[PDB]
RNA sequence: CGUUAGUUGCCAGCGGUUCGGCCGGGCACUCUAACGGGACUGCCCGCGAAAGCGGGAGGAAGGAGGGGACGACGUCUGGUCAGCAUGGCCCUUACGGCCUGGGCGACACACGUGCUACAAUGCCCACUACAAAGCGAUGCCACCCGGCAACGGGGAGCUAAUCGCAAAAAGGUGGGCCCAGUUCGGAUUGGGGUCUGCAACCCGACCCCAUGAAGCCGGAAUCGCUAGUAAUCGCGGAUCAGCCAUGCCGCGG
């Protein structure tokens, strides 16, 4: 029991907040709730599109939600069809009359949560985990990414004994807060039980 | 000592006011 | 906790003293910070995730 | 101190006598971090010793400390089962603290009501060869020369 | 000097000397010394019998005191004891009354520790 | 040391019940789960079953006990 | 004409205004001894003058706020020595060995979780 | 009298929002008092690190609200010309009181 | 230490004064909070092959300056399915669902952690001086009146470097106590009462009267701390209508 969260470590420098706005004593409570309804609802609909981060900004009653997706085409739909359905569904939950933006993510293999999702997807389909891990490390390592690390939690391959897997490559120095280590977590649910997937990507120096 | 509630120091210990420790 | 114990959300408590905090995310009964509406656990989880604006790592 | 020598702290010279031995003694009197209380006790006790006796409280303070300094003490060393009382010399630094501590401890076993009254009288007795602090010193010097049979265990 | 039902404090300050009376604490002594117009710092042995009799006149019948107080309180217990009151039951079994915890540290009320085996 | 400071509280359940019982004469045992309430002078002479959480215990209400609350005579704990 | 130094000790500041004069010292509109004098170490603030024998040369007007009175006395000890160097920078070679111009950076150690007061650990039994 | 109270959790957001306001008013108004910073309201939250004790392992966080003041003296139009809606920053919050 | 910045700051400087930074006024200073500078064994002596060690000057600061955040491959089948998520297995007029009441506070005992003390370097009373960090929109409540008081009425200010919690306590000067189960010690208990709350019997805190216990430095054993440290003193906060907080997390003397 050690190794505190890397993103929670880096929120000050080399990482920003997924929500950037201001509130008061009588405001912050519900505004934070609205942010969690938003990220909650997107992950339901937008999992197939491959979203990575949901960024919610507010100036005054305006909501600047930005979704970073690997395939922005699944988001927009044909001729702007699905960016109509679920974007009006967004202003129905919260009456803030909120507008929506989309952003492309180059190299989905370079976004840690996306790499985690990809591994968990394969685990739900029961592939070889050590290969799926080492394969996942190559997809990250073969494009920039001076470091990479992948962890898979217990019940590996549906084993009765819980295990822990491995195979980082390069350099993943979590102890230093300098070089913008990305982090993501996936959850693979299966018949034998639950599996966690931790993804570490290392890129840049200062 | 601090335990006697009708002494001035026992009043400040609990953080209360009364005849033995007025306000002003 | 239990789904029936989130009856605080529908409160109409019939007495104003029966209202309690009830962390919204996990349904925590016991320890709920009033400013975030989140329990100490949810608060710690959401803070690491960076979904709480302005919340840093206290160090001094 | 397993690594270093554990260098000695350098106390501030006294505000009145400019003497460090006085400031260290005032500290031994201080309890619960009330140094302003301790100094007033020690300095009022200088009035008692300078009036009831017509000498310098500076010289008697030093003269009292010198008489309580033990030249030898005993320490325990594990040898073949149960340990022994082993006499050995006292470090000049240790003679500093021991005499001061004994002087303050002996003065509080005194009968006198007020603190400064006990201090001045104890210092007066200690300077004259009597008093409770000198008894502890003499009793320690009795432990040495008694177990002197173990003088081969010096270490 | 006898003030209340037989009560003889001596040689100390009067205000403190009255605390030796049963129905008198520091509060009622400072009040008697006040309304009687008597210096509280004066020694008991230096008290004028004229200031003594005035103290007696006030204190004797202003509040119920040693004899009557002991009975009144003792009659105040039998009262809540003769009724089936819970507070009286806590007095019967010699246990705390104000609603403390009895699992530990009841020693004052409970007749200090009488140990059993384990 | 006991203080309600004004409007000495008695639950409305038994209050409207006992005063109407006085109009028709002294009645028999009564059901009471409200030990929150105090005792008022017009209760003297009745018999009230107060709940322990388990059982209903008949309590004869007298003059000396007017100042107290129901449940003071209906204890909860069971020891020895 | 006039000379100044700041000085600081343990969350306390003391503005030292040294002017040539009779030697009388003013603190917060009060005499030096009406603020102190019940405080034995008070005289240690004026030691920078006695090292250079500046007792009777200068008056003083001092404004003190922050911390407790003891840290103020040291805060005054530095402000007197800081101004005294601005008057004559040759006074540095005399003032330096005594260390009256050295700031004391010892500050209250922050209280730490798991302990009671920043070092003191809760006692345990093991049985 | 025109007061402008700047508030936000990011100290770089305020200064980026404050300097853009002064560079618009200084081309028109008199000498502006300046970016006078107000102290920070620090709310601290100490939470036990894990659930289900190990009480003595807690870690704490701090949310800091920085504040700023502007005080444009005698602005008329060319100050308010550039002051309608030109600002980029988001995490900032502004108030106005006359 | 400087730069930027001045409605906390100031007869440093004059002007005015109801002598209160109060006004006039100014940013120098204290300060506040953003960016920078600063320390590198760089300089000298000595040792050494080197890394480095010893000492010295200059310096606010030196050999990691002080304190944090940070805890590696793994270990203990460690802890928690009762925060959450969850495989499998059971329950379904019921293990589920509502309510009132009671319990989680029980007491012949034991251990743990703490609080308060056994006192004269102390206690009580009056008087008076010096902190830092936080909290507050029906919440903080100056101030006035009532009341011994808890508190109530009235009511000013404060979206708060501007108003309020607020008094810091030890300390200082003055006075009382004179070694005595007491002017130490505040347990227990009778009685009277404020406040929150639908509601204080189980089972609240607070005030006032009276009661005034054990305890006169603790057996074997055992704990913390190496410098603003231990010891001691008070202050604030989180949760919370209230509060059993002596706990916890911070703050400075
Ligand atoms: Mg596999
Ligand atoms: Mg990094
Ligand atoms: Mg007392
Ligand atoms: Mg569940
Ligand atoms: Mg509640
Ligand atoms: Mg052996
Ligand atoms: Mg209790
Ligand atoms: Mg039996
Ligand atoms: Mg000049
Ligand atoms: Mg600190
Ligand atoms: Mg401390
Ligand atoms: Mg333990
Ligand atoms: Mg804990
Ligand atoms: Mg500066
Ligand atoms: Mg200002
Ligand atoms: Mg000045
Ligand atoms: Mg003029
Ligand atoms: Mg004028
Ligand atoms: Mg004027
Ligand atoms: Mg006036
Ligand atoms: Mg004046
Ligand atoms: Mg005034
Ligand atoms: Mg004006
Ligand atoms: Mg003007
Ligand atoms: Mg060296
Ligand atoms: Mg050096
Ligand atoms: Mg080294
Ligand atoms: Mg360090
Ligand atoms: Mg490191
Ligand atoms: Mg097990
Ligand atoms: Mg385990
Ligand atoms: Mg319990
Ligand atoms: Mg039995
Ligand atoms: Mg104990
Ligand atoms: Mg009045
Ligand atoms: Mg301001
Ligand atoms: Mg102001
Ligand atoms: Mg303002
Ligand atoms: Mg005030
Ligand atoms: Mg005195
Ligand atoms: Mg006894
Ligand atoms: Mg007594
Ligand atoms: Mg005694
Ligand atoms: Mg250490
Ligand atoms: Mg509270
Ligand atoms: Mg209310
Ligand atoms: Mg407290
Ligand atoms: Zn939660």
DSSP string, H64-75: EEEEEE---SS-
- Answer whether A109's CB lies under 8 Å from A166's CB: no
Contacts of E1 (CB under 8 A, 6+ apart): E8, E9, E10, E44, E47, E52
Contacts of B10 (CB under 8 A, 6+ apart): B1, B2, B3, B4
Is C35 within 8 Å of A28 when comparing Cβ atoms?
A: yes
What is the spatial distance, in angstroms and rounded to an integer, between the CA atom of A71 and the C1' atom of I97?
47
Burial zone of B13 (CB within 10 Å; 0-12 exposed, 13-18 middle, 19+ buried): middle
Closest residue by Cα to residue G58 from G29, G95, G86: G86
Closest residue by Cα to residue G87 from G117, G52, G56, G122: G52
Measure in Å the smallest separation between the Cα of G111 and chain H Cα atoms. 13
Nearest CA in chain F to E86: F72
Is chain C adjacent to chain A, meaning 3+ CB pairs within 8 angstroms?
Answer: yes
Q: Which residues of C are annotated as a binding site?
A: 23, 26, 39, 42
Closest residue by Cα to residue A193 from A143, A158, A150: A158
Is chain E adjacent to chain G, meaning 3+ CB pairs within 8 angstroms?
Answer: no
What is the spatial distance, in angstroms and rounded to an integer, between the CA atom of G67 and the C1' atom of I132?
8
Both structure tokens of G13: 């500041």
Q: Where are the beta strands (DSSP E) in D40-140?
A: 72-77, 84-89
Q: Which residues partner with A189 through β-bridges? A: A194
**CB of A33 less than 8 A from some CB of C:** yes
Is E83 within 8 Å of F73 when comparing Cβ atoms?
A: yes
- Answer whether A169's CB lies under 8 Å from A151's CB: no
Structural domains of chain A, count: 2
Which helix H or strand E contains H97, and what residues bound it?
strand H93-97
Handedness of CA D84, D87, D91, D96 (dihedral sign): positive
Euclidean distance between CA atoms F43 and E21, whole angstroms: 42
Which residues does chain G have within 8 Å of residue H60's beta carbon, measured at their own beta carbons?
113
Q: Where are the beta strands (DSSP E) in chain A?
A: 19-20, 51-57, 66-69, 101-104, 147-152, 169-170, 181-189, 194-202
Strands H3-8 and H59-69: antiparallel
Burial zone of E40 (CB within 10 Å; 0-12 exposed, 13-18 middle, 19+ buried): middle
Closest residue by Cα to residue F50 from F25, F75, F79: F75
DSSP line for chain E: ---SSS----SSBHHHHHTTSTT--HHHHHHHHHHTT--TTSBSTT--HHHHHHHHHHHHTTS--HHHHHHHHHHHHHHHHHTT-HHHHHHHTT--SSS---SS--HHHH-S------
User: Where does chain C break, by residue before each gap (C–N > 2.5 Å)?
Assistant: none
Task: Classify domain G1-127 at the CATH topology level.
Answer: Ribosomal Protein S5; domain 2 (3.30.230)
Range of the domain at A39: 16-106
Helix or strand or coil: residue D91? coil
A126 with A96, same domain: the answer is no
- Answer whether H52's CB lies under 8 Å from H80's CB: no
Contacts of F69 (CB under 8 A, 6+ apart): F35, F36, F37, F38, F39
Q: Which residue is nearest to nucleotide I186 (CA to C1')?
A: B4
Phi, psi of G88 (to 5 degrees): -125, 110
Euclidean distance between CA atoms A29 and C20, whole angstroms: 15
In the block, which residue shows the tokens 């599996």? A195
A78 with A28, same domain: the answer is yes
Strands A169-170 and A147-152: antiparallel
Question: Which of D9, D15, D26, D30 is the best residue to mutate to test the G interface, defined by the most G CB atoms within 10 Å of its own CB?
Answer: D15
- Specified resolution (Å): 3.5
Q: What is the signed CA dihedral for A42, A48, A50, A52, rounded to 10 degrees?
A: 30
DSSP line for G63-115: EEESS-HHHHHHHHHHHHHHHHHHH-TTHHHHHTTTTTTS-B---PPPP-TTS
Phi, psi of G74 (to 5 degrees): -70, -40
Euclidean distance between CA atoms G11 and G73, whole angstroms: 12
Burial zone of H9 (CB within 10 Å; 0-12 exposed, 13-18 middle, 19+ buried): buried
CA distances from H94 to A60, A101, H70 (A): 10, 25, 11
Instruction: Identify the structural domains of chain F with CATH numbers, from first to last.
Output: 1-80 (3.30.860.10)
A150 with A173, same domain: the answer is yes
Question: Hey, how many other C-beta atoms are within 10 angstroms of the C-beta on H55?
Answer: 10
Closest residue by Cα to residue H9 from H41, H33, H52: H41
Q: Where are the domains of chain E?
A: 1-71, 72-118
Closest residue by Cα to residue G14 from G23, G36, G57: G36
Is chain F adjacent to chain D, meaning 3+ CB pairs within 8 angstroms?
Answer: no
Architecture of domain E72-118: Irregular (4.10)
Closest residue by Cα to residue A149 from A130, A129, A167: A167
Euclidean distance between CA atoms D41 and D55, whole angstroms: 19
Burial zone of G56 (CB within 10 Å; 0-12 exposed, 13-18 middle, 19+ buried): exposed
CA distances from H28 to H44, H72, H87 (A): 42, 10, 18
Nucleotide nearest to H53 (CA to C1'): I79
Strands G13-20 and G3-5: antiparallel
Which helix H or strand E contains A70, and what residues bound it?
none
Answer whether residue A50 is part of any domain. Answer: yes
> Solving technique for this entry?
X-ray
What is the spatial distance, in angstroms and rounded to an integer, between the CA atom of D5 and the C1' atom of I251?
36
Q: What is the DSSP letter of D97?
A: H
Q: Which residues partner with D125 through β-bridges? A: none
Task: Classify domain H1-98 at the CATH topology level.
Answer: Alpha-Beta Plaits (3.30.70)
- Answer whether D107's CB lies under 8 Å from D126's CB: no
DSSP line for F13-48: HHHHHHHHHHHH-----EEE---SSB--GGGTT-EE
Architecture of domain C1-60: Irregular (4.10)
Q: Which residue is nearest to nucleotide I195 (CA to C1')?
A: F5
User: Where does chain F break, by residue before each gap (C–N > 2.5 Å)?
Assistant: none
Which domain-ending residue is among A45, A74, A106? A106
Question: From the CA of A176, how far away is ligand 29's center (Å)?
Answer: 6
Which residues does chain D have within 8 Å of residue G38's beta carbon, measured at their own beta carbons?
36
In the block, which residue shows the tokens 């709940």? F51
A127 with A188, same domain: the answer is yes
Q: Which residue is nearest to nucleotide I108 (CA to C1')?
A: E116
CA distances from G78 to D9, G14, G15, G16 (A): 22, 9, 10, 9
Query: In C1-60, which ranges are continuous DSSP H helix?
Result: 40-48
Question: From the CA of D4, how far away is ligand 27's center (Å)?
Answer: 14
Is A7 within 8 Å of C47 when comparing Cβ atoms?
A: no
What CATH number does the domain located at D1-155 have?
1.10.455.10
Euclidean distance between CA atoms A33 and A35, whole angstroms: 5
Nucleotide nearest to C16 (CA to C1'): I241
Both structure tokens of H70: 């502007």
Nearest CA in chain G to D23: G41
DSSP line for chain B: -TT-TTSHHHHHHHT--SSSS---
Which residues does chain G have within 8 Å of residue D43's beta carbon, measured at their own beta carbons?
40
Question: From the CA of H78, how far away is ligand 24's center (Å)?
Answer: 25
Handedness of CA H80, H85, H90, H94 (dihedral sign): positive
Q: What is the DSSP letter of G117?
A: B
Both structure tokens of H66: 């920085």
Nucleotide nearest to G118 (CA to C1'): I229
Helix or strand or coil: residue D20? helix
Which residues does chain D have within 8 Å of residue G44's beta carbon, measured at their own beta carbons?
12, 15
Measure in Å the smallest separation between the Cα of H40 and chain A Cα atoms. 14
Q: What is the DSSP letter of A155?
A: S
- Chain I: nucleotides under 7 Å from a protein CB? 1, 4-7, 10-13, 29-35, 58-61, 65-80, 82-88, 96-103, 105-118, 120-126, 129-137, 143, 148-151, 159-162, 166-173, 176-179, 182-195, 197-214, 222-241, 244, 246, 248-253
Nucleotide nearest to C22 (CA to C1'): I83
Euclidean distance between CA atoms G117 and G121, whole angstroms: 8
Phi, psi of F48 (to 5 degrees): -125, 130
Which domain-ending residue is among A89, A106, A123? A106
Both structure tokens of G94: 């005399």
Closest residue by Cα to residue D104 from D53, D38, D44, D155: D38
Question: From the CA of B22, how far away is ligand 39's center (Å)?
Answer: 14
Question: Hey, how many other C-beta atoms are within 10 angstroms of the C-beta on G72?
Answer: 27
Nearest CA in chain G to D42: G40
Task: Classify domain E1-71 at the CATH topology level.
Answer: Helicase, Ruva Protein; domain 3 (1.10.8)
Answer whether residue A3 is part of any domain. Answer: no
Closest residue by Cα to residue H64 from H29, H25, H37, H82: H37
Q: What is the DSSP letter of H60?
A: E
Question: From the CA of G29, how far away is ligand 19's center (Å)?
Answer: 21
Contacts of A25 (CB under 8 A, 6+ apart): C35
Nearest CA in chain H to G114: H56
Is H46 within 8 Å of G113 when comparing Cβ atoms?
A: yes
Q: Where are the domains of chain C?
A: 1-60
Question: Hey, how many other C-beta atoms are within 10 angstroms of the C-beta on D154?
Answer: 10
Helix or strand or coil: residue H39? strand
Is D36 within 8 Å of G39 when comparing Cβ atoms?
A: yes
Measure in Å the smallest separation between the Cα of F66 and chain E Cα atoms. 11
Euclidean distance between CA atoms H67 and H4, whole angstroms: 10
Euclidean distance between CA atoms A182 and A202, whole angstroms: 6
- Answer whether D86's CB lies under 8 Å from D155's CB: yes
Euclidean distance between CA atoms G77 and G44, whole angstroms: 7
Of H45, H51, H62, the CB nearest to C41: H51
Q: Which residue is nearest to nucleotide I172 (CA to C1')?
A: G38
User: Which partners does chain D have (≥3 C-beta pairs < 8 Å)?
Assistant: G
Residue F72 zone, left/alpha/beta (φ > 0; ψ -120 to 50; rest): alpha
Euclidean distance between CA atoms D122 and D103, whole angstroms: 7
Question: Hey, how many other C-beta atoms are within 10 angstroms of the C-beta on D41?
Answer: 20
User: Which partners does chain E have (≥3 C-beta pairs < 8 Å)?
Assistant: F
């Amino acid at each position: 029991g050690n190794k505190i969260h890397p993103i929670g470590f880096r929120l000050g420098i080399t990482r920003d907040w997924e929500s950037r706005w201001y509130a008061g004593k009588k405001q912050y409570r519900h505004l934070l709730l609205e942010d969690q309804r938003i990220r909650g609802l997107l992950e339901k609909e937008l999992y197939s599109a491959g979203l990575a981060r949901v960024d919610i900004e507010r100036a005054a009653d305006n909501v600047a939600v930005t979704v970073h997706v690997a395939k922005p085409g699944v988001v927009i739909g044909r001729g702007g069809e699905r960016i109509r359905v679920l974007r009006e569904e967004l202003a129905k939950l919260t009456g803030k009359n909120v507008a929506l933006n989309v952003q492309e993510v180059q190299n989905p293999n370079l976004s840690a949560p996306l790499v985690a999702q990809r591994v968990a997807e394969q685990i739900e389909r029961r592939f070889a985990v050590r290969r799926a891990i080492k394969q996942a490390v190559q997809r990250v390592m073969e494009s920039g990414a001076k470091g990479a690390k992948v962890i898979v939690s217990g019940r590996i391959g549906g084993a009765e004994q819980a295990r822990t897997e491995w195979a980082a490559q390069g350099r993943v120095p979590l102890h230093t807060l300098r070089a913008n280590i990305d982090y993501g977590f996936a959850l693979a649910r299966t018949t034998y039980g639950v599996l966690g997937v931790k993804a570490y990507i290392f890129l840049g120096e200062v | 000592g601090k335990g006697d509630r009708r002494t001035r120091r026992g009043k400040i210990w609990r953080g209360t006011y009364g005849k033995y420790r007025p306000r002003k | 906790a239990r789904k029936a114990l989130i009856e605080k959300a529908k409160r109409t408590p019939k007495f104003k003293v029966r209202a309690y905090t009830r962390c919204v995310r996990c349904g925590r009964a016991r320890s709920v910070y009033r400013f975030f509406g989140l329990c100490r656990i949810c608060l710690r989880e959401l803070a690491h995730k960076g979904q709480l604006p302005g919340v840093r790592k206290a160090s001094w | 101190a397993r690594r270093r020598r554990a260098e000695v702290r350098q106390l501030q010279p006294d505000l009145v006598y400019g003497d460090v031995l006085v400031t260290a003694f005032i500290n031994k009197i201080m309890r619960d971090g009330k140094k302003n209380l301790a100094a007033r006790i020690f300095y009022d006790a200088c009035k008692i010793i300078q009036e009831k006796t017509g000498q310098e409280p500076l010289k008697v303070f030093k003269q009292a400390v010198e008489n309580v300094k033990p030249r030898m003490e005993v320490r325990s060393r594990r040898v073949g089962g149960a340990n022994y009382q082993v006499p050995m010399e006292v470090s000049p630094r240790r003679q500093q603290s021991l005499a001061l501590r004994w002087l303050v401890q002996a003065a509080n076993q005194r009968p006198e009501r007020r603190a400064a009254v006990r201090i001045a009288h104890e210092l007066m007795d200690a300077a004259e060869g009597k008093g409770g602090a000198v008894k502890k010193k003499e009793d320690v010097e009795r432990m040495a020369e008694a177990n002197r049979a173990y003088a081969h265990y010096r270490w | 000097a006898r003030i209340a039902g037989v009560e003889i404090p001596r040689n100390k300050r009067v205000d403190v000397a009255l605390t030796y009376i049963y129905g008198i604490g520091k509060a009622r002594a400072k009040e008697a010394l006040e309304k009687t117009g008597i210096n509280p710092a004066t020694r008991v042995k230096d008290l004028t019998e004229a200031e003594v009799v005035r103290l007696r006149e006030y204190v004797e019948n202003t509040w119920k005191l040693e004899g009557e107080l002991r009975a009144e309180v003792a009659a105040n217990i039998k009262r809540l004891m003769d009724i089936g009151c819970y507070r009286g039951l806590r007095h019967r079994r010699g246990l705390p009354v104000r609603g403390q915890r009895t699992r530990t540290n009841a020693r004052t009320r409970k007749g200090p520790r009488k140990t059993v085996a384990g | 040391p006991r203080s309600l400071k004004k409007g000495v509280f008695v639950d409305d359940h038994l209050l409207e019940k006992v005063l109407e019982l006085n109009a028709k004469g002294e009645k028999r045992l009564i059901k009471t789960w409200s030990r929150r309430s105090t005792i008022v002078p017009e209760m003297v002479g009745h018999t009230i079953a107060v709940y322990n959480g388990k059982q209903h215990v008949p309590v004869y209400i007298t003059e000396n006990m007017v100042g107290h609350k129901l449940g003071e005579f209906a204890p909860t704990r069971t020891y020895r | 004409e006039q000379y100044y130094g700041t000085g600081r000790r343990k969350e306390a500041v003391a503005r030292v205004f040294l002017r040539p004069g009779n030697g009388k010292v003013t603190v917060n509109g009060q005499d030096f001894n009406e603020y102190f004098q019940g405080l034995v170490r008070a005289v240690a603030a004026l030691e920078p003058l006695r090292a250079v024998d500046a007792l009777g040369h200068f008056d003083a007007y001092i404004t003190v706020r922050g911390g407790g009175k003891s840290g103020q006395i040291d805060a005054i000890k530095l402000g007197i020595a800081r101004a005294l160097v601005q008057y004559n920078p040759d006074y540095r070679a005399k003032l330096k060995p005594l260390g009256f111009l050295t700031r004391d950076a010892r500050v209250v150690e922050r209280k730490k979780y798991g302990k009671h007061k920043a070092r003191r650990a809760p006692q345990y039994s093991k049985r | 009298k025109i007061r402008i109270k700047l508030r936000g959790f990011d100290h770089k957001t305020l200064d980026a929002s404050a300097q853009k306001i002064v560079e618009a008013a200084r081309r028109s108004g008199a000498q502006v008092s300046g970016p006078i910073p107000l102290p920070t309201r620090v709310r601290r939250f100490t939470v036990i690190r894990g659930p289900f004790k190990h009480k003595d392992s807690r870690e704490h966080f701090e949310l800091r609200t920085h504040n700023r003041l502007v005080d444009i003296i005698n602005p008329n139009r060319k100050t308010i010309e550039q002051l309608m809606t030109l600002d980029l920053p988001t995490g900032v919050e502004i108030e106005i009181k006359t």
